[PDB]
Amino acid sequence: RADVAQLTQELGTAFFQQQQLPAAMADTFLEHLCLLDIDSEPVAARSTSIIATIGPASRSVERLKEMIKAGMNIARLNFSHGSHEYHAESIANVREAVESFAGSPLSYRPVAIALDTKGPGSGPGLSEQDVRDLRFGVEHGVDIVFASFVRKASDVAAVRAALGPEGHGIKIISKIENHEGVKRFDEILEVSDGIMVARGDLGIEIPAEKVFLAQKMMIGRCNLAGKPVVCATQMLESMITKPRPTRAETSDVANAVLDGADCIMLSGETAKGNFPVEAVKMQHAIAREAEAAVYHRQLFEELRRAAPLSRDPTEVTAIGAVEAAFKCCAAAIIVLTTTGRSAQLLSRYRPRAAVIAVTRSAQAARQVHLCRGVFPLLYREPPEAIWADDVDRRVQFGIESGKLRGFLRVGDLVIVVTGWRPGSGYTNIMRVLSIS
Amino acid sequence: GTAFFQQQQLPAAMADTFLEHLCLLDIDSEPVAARSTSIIATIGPASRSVERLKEMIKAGMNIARLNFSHGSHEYHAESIANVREAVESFAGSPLSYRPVAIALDTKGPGSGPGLSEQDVRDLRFGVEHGVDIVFASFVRKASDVAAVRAALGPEGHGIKIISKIENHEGVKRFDEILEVSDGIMVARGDLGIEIPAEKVFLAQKMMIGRCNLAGKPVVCATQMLESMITKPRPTRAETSDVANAVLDGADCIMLSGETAKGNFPVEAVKMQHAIAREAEAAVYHRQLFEELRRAAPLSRDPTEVTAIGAVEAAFKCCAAAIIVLTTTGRSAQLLSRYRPRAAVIAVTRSAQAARQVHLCRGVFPLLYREPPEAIWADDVDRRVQFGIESGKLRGFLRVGDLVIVVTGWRPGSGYTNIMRVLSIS
Amino acid sequence: ELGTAFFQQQQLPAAMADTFLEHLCLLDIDSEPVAARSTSIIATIGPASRSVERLKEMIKAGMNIARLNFSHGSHEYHAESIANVREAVESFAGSPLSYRPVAIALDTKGPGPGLSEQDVRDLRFGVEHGVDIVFASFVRKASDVAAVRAALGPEGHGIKIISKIENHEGVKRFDEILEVSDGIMVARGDLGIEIPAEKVFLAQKMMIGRCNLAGKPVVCATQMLESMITKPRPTRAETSDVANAVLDGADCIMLSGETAKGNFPVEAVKMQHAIAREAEAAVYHRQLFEELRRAAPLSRDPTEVTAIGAVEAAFKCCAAAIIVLTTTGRSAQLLSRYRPRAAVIAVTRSAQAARQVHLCRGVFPLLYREPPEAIWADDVDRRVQFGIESGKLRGFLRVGDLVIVVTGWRPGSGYTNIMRVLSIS
Amino acid sequence: AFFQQQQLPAAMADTFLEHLCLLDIDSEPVAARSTSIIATIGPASRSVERLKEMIKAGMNIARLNFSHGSHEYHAESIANVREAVESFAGSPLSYRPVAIALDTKGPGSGGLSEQDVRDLRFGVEHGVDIVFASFVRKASDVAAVRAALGPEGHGIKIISKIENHEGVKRFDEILEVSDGIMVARGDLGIEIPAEKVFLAQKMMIGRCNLAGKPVVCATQMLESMITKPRPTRAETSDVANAVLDGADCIMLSGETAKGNFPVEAVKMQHAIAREAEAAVYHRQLFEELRRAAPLSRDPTEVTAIGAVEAAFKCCAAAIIVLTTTGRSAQLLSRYRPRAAVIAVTRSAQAARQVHLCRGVFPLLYREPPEAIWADDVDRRVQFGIESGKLRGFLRVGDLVIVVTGWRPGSGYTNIMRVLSIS
Ligand SMILES: O=S(=O)(NCc1ccc(S(=O)(=O)c2cccc(O)c2)cc1)c1ccc(O)c(O)c1
Ligand SMILES: O=S(=O)(NCc1ccc(S(=O)(=O)c2cccc(O)c2)cc1)c1ccc(O)c(O)c1
Ligand SMILES: O=P(O)(O)OC[C@H]1O[C@](O)(COP(=O)(O)O)[C@@H](O)[C@@H]1O
Ligand SMILES: O=P(O)(O)OC[C@H]1O[C@](O)(COP(=O)(O)O)[C@@H](O)[C@@H]1O
Ligand SMILES: O=P(O)(O)OC[C@H]1O[C@](O)(COP(=O)(O)O)[C@@H](O)[C@@H]1O
Ligand SMILES: O=P(O)(O)OC[C@H]1O[C@](O)(COP(=O)(O)O)[C@@H](O)[C@@H]1O
Ligand SMILES: O=C([O-])C(=O)[O-]
Ligand SMILES: O=C([O-])C(=O)[O-]
Ligand SMILES: O=C([O-])C(=O)[O-]
Ligand SMILES: O=C([O-])C(=O)[O-]
Ligand SMILES: [K+]
Ligand SMILES: [K+]
Ligand SMILES: [K+]
Ligand SMILES: [K+]
Ligand SMILES: [Mg+2]
Ligand SMILES: [Mg+2]
Ligand SMILES: [Mg+2]
Ligand SMILES: [Mg+2]
């Protein structure tokens, strides 16, 4: 009580009853569970990204606008079905729906485009159709590749080579769908940007009753590595034909978030189902509840202890900033990033504070949706003559978008993370600012 | 041996942090322990035949649920008789006989404020037919439990009352309901309609946590393997749901339509059995036991003191089992609350207690049918040997294993006070 | 049941704290110690403490082990010291409330590369005079212990060898020395000359920690109350030193010149007694027991498994004592290694074991001399009641208290496998 | 080699038992001694030449015991201390500030005595930094001392001496209004049973550590060194245990005031404190300090925990902080970082007073000002870095954490920076 008494008197008892704060402050995991409250409403913005598969049920520009408003962050194109012409039209429709909100830069929501490959099938490695589809992705500017049936590190090197010199910036998320992928997980994760727990094929390749062990192990190892992990397949399966999900389905979504997943995915629920927008809304609602129920007290202690000592200033600043944010219940951590890396290093410590990432890179703004709790703001202004003033303008842009989206209020504390010189790789400063 | 320490997620169970525990989970680490989470199967047209009920007992059904929201007293009496006929068909081999509890799930109050007149008639039927458990529908306050207890009368004092929490008021008045109940059921079907669907997981995790703290049984119910009503395999969300209910701390998992009216009732029981075994091995006992020990209050009750000493002793030697002699099941329940990895083999002469201890995770009841020996200490030893011989036949024990034996200083309930380290010969 | 006053004594609020910081903040000078003093006091016998009348006063003040320093005096001088100690100890044989066994320890002169000629003759003298313990001076390697062990001839293998670590080599070869020794003495006098004085506290804390991990006795020695050789009261550094040796985990604390040649030998014993009682109540059992439990390897030895189960049971009910039947002292030692807050009352038929168990913190020996009963279970019950009645007589127990009883399944050393919860009647 | 020094295997242990088992007599201390030494000035330590030797041996605070001697005697003691301290001012990168503390006579049979009022006024007139207020029993005793210091003595630190049962019982109210505490074991050991003093010491140190306020352990720490060249085994153990308990300062009374080995007593406390600081179990300590410290919306408090967390993440050689009053350095010190807290200040009084906080190394900035505030700030940072390099705290390639504010004036610390040396 004395460790939260003055902040309780200051912020009020109502503040400490919302977002499962009594449960988050508990001394044991048992007490944390006992303190979970259905009347404790979530306050924070939803941090787990939603990946929606695009298909006949979610292809129209008007339908895509509704899905963006419902919470879709990443659009998945399943190259197991449809022609290149079909997928190019899907891409164009997504971009048209996304840019329809670009008129207001302080509220614009970027949406990443991910290409899910067909896979090797009976083959030993990269198929000829995969090579053509990967070149299509580079030519159409996709942000992410979900590489199907990755079984070893050489499979991801083949995908990287097929993307060529122009696709160096594309993120490769390896799909683990069989026993070999699970057994060679460490070598696959080392060369990948992230992982997808593809439970559909995984549940056929290994006994169905063992999939939860593979999911929890891979999420844990991705969290340890600080790399994005996606939980996928049959999350809200019954919503393909019904307006409401089963009790097992809502539980599954909540548990993927509690496990530590950065992203949650919808496949047939959005691609061919009768309720694509409702499926996105349901994942949004469950993820907000589940994020507030995360036991940050032990989680942060374990992430901190597991993370090795580092002499990289971005790594050092990131842990100092997350520690500072927890100390004052900071509403947000505003970070300036070029590639998204500084925001990713903040995200790996699982702060409760939203990580508002201000970037000039449209691709980085789309790709940071892979990292839990990163809210990208695309800055379109031309540079100031004085670099320090250009930095300050970018920080104020983050505060003003934060106030105009509800993340920040006057009186809040914010943590600002910047670097000492222009260019990527020099983040080294953490500032505590009071919102006026 | 090295092989012993690679099975049943033992590297993951020994980890120093929960993060390291998750990272060490292995799909190739096979479960060795017997399945400790009980399976409740609802009886209906798909699972009423004596031959079908025998298959479900072999698949792992521990409790048969009679849903009094459907069917007449005549229908439920035939269900009871069919269950008992299927259960007693294995009584010829006492070392392998599996007791099966009968639970009566009430229709509920409906629009009424308290106990309905149909519920009073159904509760009397249950007492007259010897049901072991009552799943009391829509419990909203402690007085609802007292009304059910009064309707059971003096002859139904031994029946367990498991309160179903199905609405916001039941969640808010949870502590007072749990205090007077024998346990709880998280009735997710109605709960998901009474409260927002996206909040049911918080109510489930909270109630399971509080029941685990109280040392009282908690059942997770509804739509666990819903798709298996028409399909032979469940969805990825359904297997995850069953595994997570076990990881949350549920003592029992339930099947409703999957066994009452579906096309795969035996397969639905086999699937819950398979998932529960995997999930139990993935329990992080290192932190779990530490938290249960610290949360449990100090006690001057010798059964309570012997139970914690026995669970501590079982962890120290990796005991294959804790064999406990019990009359009412209470000594086995107090062992179960500390969540030992060792199976709790409960030897009893009470057929009702043998059925009712299925409510407690990790309790394997053995019904002893021999008449008492003239010398009490010899009668005690004969029962303990019956526990060892059943354990060996069923695969729980092998020669060379260490077992913890929990007994009392005199006959009669309430006198457990002895813990003994035994080597299996 | 116990009252608010019970939970305010013996630093119980501080012992229940969730963190070590909160434990320190809750220490209270008004919280009085209730438990009997568990850290044994070793007093060096010399001109100031040799008379039978003076030795009776030191026994009453709390002396448990009499140390004979073979660096000074002849065999004839030490034989008279032994006879005077035995005469003073046996002067209380008539009164059960006052009779306490007192061990006799021989501290060797020391080495030369290995065992000196005088040490061989002195060790032979110790065997001939029935000493219980040998404090082997300047042990540097495992072969030094083996030489002392071999010098204990055909008749002295039951004597305990406590190795004195007095130099850099002994500290560096600590693990191999501890493995072959019965215990260790942190001989700070010579150690403080052999290594920099400012590093002695590191060596003391390390050796005490490793001895606690191994479950072997550790003695903290030299200059603990040095100023009391000439002054009636010690310095603030001296009382702090005694308290910190107990808090570190020392089984025994020692007095050298303070008792052998000083002006206040009895007052020095009284002061160590007073400080040790306060320091024992201030032990942070919550984290201590958790760490001892986790550090101790898994065991298939039933004595080791019973001991942890019994200490866990004692903590659960705030047992007034753990009564253990032991012939060699081993069962009492395995209880002592988990640092229970309850007194370990060790009932033995062995006078040697009764004297030697003073090396283990919290062990209160009772020598039992009744003729054996024909029925073994009757003999066991009689020794258990002897422990309860002596406990009642000495203030450890009252009617209504709970005790933990540790016994085995058959006669003979090595079969402890039973833990019972008993109510004092 | 780096990970074998300063008990680093023992500091990384998963349990306190394993931490103890891993303590190594061959693991040498590398960090600068963080626990300050308070030496009592008397006949054996009054000469300017003797005081220079004590400053070199490690004396950080000079204590004037007003229970003995006249105002004329103490004024000469003050002048001799200042002369010895300023004899090293020729080299600003290595100059060591020394605080002057006035220990009052006390109330005796009486609240605040008339002699105490005259002595407190003497202290203000002679510019003392700290007052060790004898026999404090309640919060009103502290208020009386504060009032006696008047308007000219607002900046003086009041360290309350707890010497009796009432002071122990009313501890929380006394600590709330005091700047810190002294565990005055001499009188405490006569007022309460001697066997209970260790409980009072450990409780008060724990509560001061929780409050983030300085605590001094005092009396008979190396008593035998008044006549002997080496201390007893109990005395070295006592000093080590006071440091391990969490004391910010350790004190010498008769050992330096009247003993035959005043310089050797200071050297012995220095040697023991260095060893004891390396044996601190930071893994559990930092976790507990972090959890115990309340949530805060004060940017200095928030920056302090972020900086200590960052220092542990990279094994930073130092945390360089700019402070006017010493407060920013005190808030870093409360989290017990292994990294030295190099406090760069212009205030000569703050530089002397921060010796009360464990691990704070004051540097008195006497370099010319920069016209641009930002350039002035960077220059004070470079000053900390050069003084750290000269004194052995830092080497090229080391990482430091730099703690500054957004605008001039005290109370605005809000920035933490990760900097690579040279
Ligand atoms: O939110 S956490 O901090 N939770 C950790 C946790 C602790 C203990 C258990 S227990 O011992 O199984 C248990 C204990 C009590 C009741 C009970 O029902 C179960 C479970 C979980 C987290 C999540 C993911 C991570 O990767 C991580 O590093 C940390
Ligand atoms: O009684 S114990 O459990 N001692 C607990 C202990 C843990 C951590 C620390 S600390 O982190 O340095 C520390 C120091 C000061 C304040 C503070 O907040 C934290 C000091 C002491 C014990 C004693 C001996 C053993 O062998 C053993 O396994 C356990
Ligand atoms: O996260 P990244 O990709 O390393 O980018 C962080 C970089 O952004 C900045 O804060 C601002 O840099 P720019 O002026 O190039 O946009 C740098 O100081 C820092 O190095
Ligand atoms: O768990 P319960 O119902 O308290 O039953 C435990 C009882 O069983 C026993 O072990 C054996 O008693 P019975 O001989 O009456 O079966 C008693 O000693 C003990 O009191
Ligand atoms: O501590 P120790 O030497 O192993 O002795 C414990 C032994 O004492 C007993 O409890 C009683 O044995 P005795 O009747 O032979 O004295 C044995 O069952 C047990 O093996
Ligand atoms: O520790 P204190 O007393 O708050 O002083 C810290 C102050 O030091 C600074 O970093 C430098 O300020 P000055 O220019 O006044 O020296 C301030 O911005 C900050 O408020
Ligand atoms: O391919 C997939 O996404 C799967 O199998 O889940
Ligand atoms: O009654 C039930 O089982 C439900 O509503 O879920
Ligand atoms: O002999 C001893 O005890 C010593 O040297 O400390
Ligand atoms: O005045 C003091 O410091 C004492 O009495 O200890
Ligand atoms: K695909
Ligand atoms: K019903
Ligand atoms: K000797
Ligand atoms: K004084
Ligand atoms: Mg697939
Ligand atoms: Mg219902
Ligand atoms: Mg010696
Ligand atoms: Mg005094």
How would DSSP label each residue in D7-69? THHHHT-SSHHHHHHT--TTS---SPP-SEEEEEESGGG-SHHHHHHHHHHTEEEEEEETTSS
Gap between the Cα atoms of D373 and D322, Å rounded: 13
Q: What is the rounded CA–CA span in Å between residue C392 and residue D63? A: 55
Q: How far is A86 from chain B (nearest CA, A)?
A: 29
Q: Do D417 and A428 touch (CB under 8 A)?
A: yes
Method: X-ray
Write the CB contacts of B72 (distance below 8 Å, at least 6 apart in sequence).
none
Chains interfacing with D (3 or more CB pairs < 8 Å): A, C
Task: List CB contacts (< 8 A) between C422 and chain B.
Answer: 417
Q: How far apart, in whole angstroms, are the C-alpha atoms of residue B327 and residue B348?
A: 6
* Alpha-carbon separation of residue A86 from A56, A270, B380, D248, D359 (angstroms): 10, 17, 77, 72, 67
D322, D327, D330, D367, best to mutate for ligand 6 pocket (most atoms within 8 Å of CB): D322
Our CA-based measurement puts residue C423 at a distance from the nearest CA of chain D, in whole angstroms, of 34
∠ CA B102-B106-B107, nearest 5°, is: 140
Find, among A361, A344, A367, the residue nearest to A170 by Cα. Answer: A367
**Binding-site annotation: residue ranges of D for Mn(2+):** 163, 187
Q: Closest Cα partner for D95 from D84, D111, D105, D79?
A: D84
For residue B229, give the DSSP letter: G
* Residues near D194 by beta carbon (within 8 Å), at least 6 away in sequence: C233, C234, C236, C239, C271, C274
Annotated binding residue at B75? Answer: no
Residues whose CB is less than 8 angstroms from the CB of residue D275 and which lie 6 or more positions away in sequence, other chains included: C198, C199, C201, C202, D29, D240
**In the numeric block, which tokens belong to residue B111?**
């629009």
Nearest CA to ligand 2 atom 14: D285
Cβ C221 under 6 angstroms from ligand 9: yes
Q: Chains contacting B with at least 3 CB pairs below 8 Å?
A: A, C
Taking an 8 Å cut-off on Cβ atoms, the answer to whether C421 and B298 are in contact is no
Distance CA D230, CA D235 (A): 10
For D291, the enclosing helix (H) or strand (E) is helix D282-292
Whether ligand 7 lies within 6 angstroms of the CB of A118 is answered as no
- Consult the annotation and say whether A80 binds a ligand: yes
CA–centroid distance, D135 to ligand 18, in Å, is 7
* Residue D358 dihedral angles phi and psi, to the nearest 5°: -55, 135
Is the Cβ–Cβ distance between A291 and A257 less than 8 Å? yes
Rounded distance between C-alpha atoms, residue C254 and residue C220, angstroms? 6
Q: Which of D200, D210, D238 sits opposite C241 (nearest CB)?
A: D238
The DSSP letter of residue B95 is: T
Residues in chain B: 425
Strand partners, B404: B322, B421
Query: For residue C158, how far is the Cα from the chain centroid?
Result: 17
Q: Is the CB of C67 under 6 A from ligand 9?
A: no
Contact yes or no for C29/D199 (Cβ under 8 A): yes
| Cα A417 to averaged position of ligand 3 atoms, centre (Å) | 10
Let me know: does D286 contact D312? Beta carbons within 8 Å.
yes
Kindly report the nearest CA distance between residue C172 and chain D, in angstroms.
9
- φ/ψ of B60, rounded to 5, equals 130, 5
Ligand 5, atom 13, lies closest to the CA of: C411
Q: What count of other Cβ atoms lies within 10 Å of the Cβ of residue D183? A: 27
Query: What is the DSSP code (8-state) at residue B333?
Result: H
The residue assigned the tokens 């630190």 is D157
- The contacts of residue B391 (CB under 8 Å, 6+ apart) are B320, B321, B323, B343, B345, B397, B403
CB D62 within 8 A of CB D101: yes
Comparing alpha-carbon positions, the chain B residue that sits nearest to A253 is: B237
Q: How far apart are CA D26 and CA D73, in angstroms?
A: 46
What residues in C contact D234, CB-CB < 8 Å?
223-226, 235, 237-238, 240-242
- Contacts of residue B171 in chain A, CB cutoff 8 Å? 38
Q: Which two tokens stand for residue A396?
A: 């104020």
| Cβ distance of C317 and B300 shorter than 8 Å | yes
The alpha-carbon radius of gyration of chain B (Å, integer) is 21
Separation CA C287–CA C21 (nearest Å):
12
Entry resolution (Å)? 2.1
Q: Are C282 and C16 in contact (CB under 8 A)?
A: no
Quote the CA–CA distance of B100 and B46 in Å, as a whole number: 18
Put simply, the answer to whether A302 touches B188 (Cβ < 8 Å) is: no
Residue nearest to atom 18 of ligand 4 (CA): B408
Ligand 13 centroid – CA C259 distance (Å)? 15
- Ligand 9 atom, smallest distance to C188 CA: 6
| Beta strand pairing call for C321-325 and C402-408 | parallel
A393 CB neighbour count, 10 Å cutoff: 15
Contact B421 C422 (CB under 8 A): no
Of A3, A309, A310, the CB nearest to D292: A3
Question: Do D360 and D99 meet the contact criterion of CB atoms below 8 Å apart?
Answer: no
The best mutation among B67, B104, B190, B219 to test binding of ligand 8, ranked by most ligand atoms within 8 Å of the C-beta, falls on B190
What residues line ligand 2, using a CB cutoff of 6 Å? C 20-21, 209, 212, 249, 283-284, 287-288, 291; D 16-17, 20, 246, 281, 284-285, 288
Q: Which residues of A touch B238 (CB under 8 A)?
A: 246, 248, 252
**Ligand 10 within 6 A of D219 CB?**
yes
Order of all β-strands in the sheet with A332-336: A374-378, A354-359, A332-336, A413-419, A427-434, D413-420, D399-405, D318-322, D340-345, D360-364
Give the helix ranges, DSSP H, for B282-317: 285-295, 302-317
Contacting residues for A250 by C-beta, under 8 A, at least 6 apart:
A282, A286, B192, B197, B198, B200, B201
Q: What is the distance in angstroms between the Cα of A350 and the nearest Cα belonging to chain D?
A: 16
Could you tell me the distance, in angstroms and rounded to a whole number, from the CA of residue C290 to the centre of ligand 1? 19
- Shortest CA gap A181–chain B (Å): 12
Q: For each of the domains in chain D, give its residue range(s) and CATH number, in order of start.
A: 33-277 (3.20.20.60), 282-420 (3.40.1380.20)
CB D10 within 8 Å of CB D23: yes
Q: Do the Cβ atoms of A199 and B236 come within 8 Å?
A: yes
Residue C241's Cα: distance from chain center in Å?
18
Contact B215, A40 (CB under 8 A): no
Instruction: Please name the chains neighbouring C, where neighbouring means 3+ C-beta pairs under 8 angstroms.
Output: B, D
- Choose the mutation target among A327, A416, A427 for the interface with D, i.e. most D CBs under 10 Å: A327
Q: Cα of A230 to ligand 7 centre, how many Å? A: 11
- CB count within 10 Å of CB C193 equals 13
Would the annotation count B189 as a binding residue? Answer: yes
Interhelix angle B302-317/C302-317, nearest 10 degrees: 140
How far apart are alpha carbons A318 and A416 in whole angstroms? 11
Distance in angstroms (rounded) separating the CA atoms of residues D187 and D343? 35
- C1/B306 Cβ within 8 A: no
Neighbours of B153 (CB within 10 A): 12
Q: Which atom of ligand 1 is nearest to the CA of A259?
A: 24
| Rounded-to-integer distance, Cα B273 and Cα B55, Å | 13
The protein residue with its alpha carbon nearest to ligand 1, atom 26, reads: B19
Spatial CB neighbours of D378, under 8 Å, sequence gap ≥ 6:
D370
Q: Is the dihedral of CA D61, D67, D68, D71 positive or negative?
A: positive
Asked if residue C314 lies in contact with residue C292, where contact means CB atoms within 8 angstroms, the answer is no
Report the 3 state secondary structure along chain C.
Answer: CCCCCCCCCCCHHHHCCCCHHHHHHCCCCCCCCCCCCCCEEEEEECHHHCCHHHHHHHHHHCEEEEEEECCCCCHHHHHHHHHHHHHHHHCCCCCCCCCCCCEEEEECCCCCCCCCHHHHHHHHHHHHCCCCEEEECCCCCHHHHHHHHHHCCCCCCCCEEEEEECCHHHHHCHHHHHHHCCEEEEEHHHHHHHCCHHHHHHHHHHHHHHHHHHCCCEEEECCCCHHHHCCCCCCHHHHHHHHHHHHHCCCEEEECHHHHCCCCHHHHHHHHHHHHHHHHHCCCHHHHHHHHHHHCCCCCCHHHHHHHHHHHHHHHHCCCEEEEECCCCHHHHHHHCCCCCCEEEEEECCHHHHHHHHHCCCEEEEECCCCCCCCHHHHHHHHHHHHHHHHHHHCCCCCCCEEEEEEECCCCCCCEEEEEEEECC
Q: Quick one: three-class SS letters along chain A? A: CCCCHHHHHHHCCCCCCCCCHHHHCCCCHHHHHHCCCCCCCCCCCCCCEEEEEECHHHCCHHHHHHHHHHCEEEEEEECCCCCHHHHHHHHHHHHHHHHCCCCCCCCCCCCEEEEECCCCCCCCCCCHHHHHHHHHHHHCCCCEEEECCCCCHHHHHHHHHHHCHHHCCCEEEEEECCHHHHHCHHHHHHHCCEEEEEHHHHHHHCCHHHHHHHHHHHHHHHHHHCCCEEEECCCCHHHHCCCCCCHHHHHHHHHHHHHCCCEEEECHHHHCCCCHHHHHHHHHHHHHHHHHCCCHHHHHHHHHHHCCCCCCHHHHHHHHHHHHHHHHCCCEEEEECCCCHHHHHHHCCCCCCEEEEEECCHHHHHHHHHCCCEEEEECCCCCCCCHHHHHHHHHHHHHHHHHHCCCCCCCCEEEEEEECCCCCCCEEEEEEEECC
* DSSP at B221: E
- Token pair 């069962």: residue: C331
Question: Cβ of C418 and B423 within 8 Å?
Answer: no
Residue B24 in tokens: 């060490």
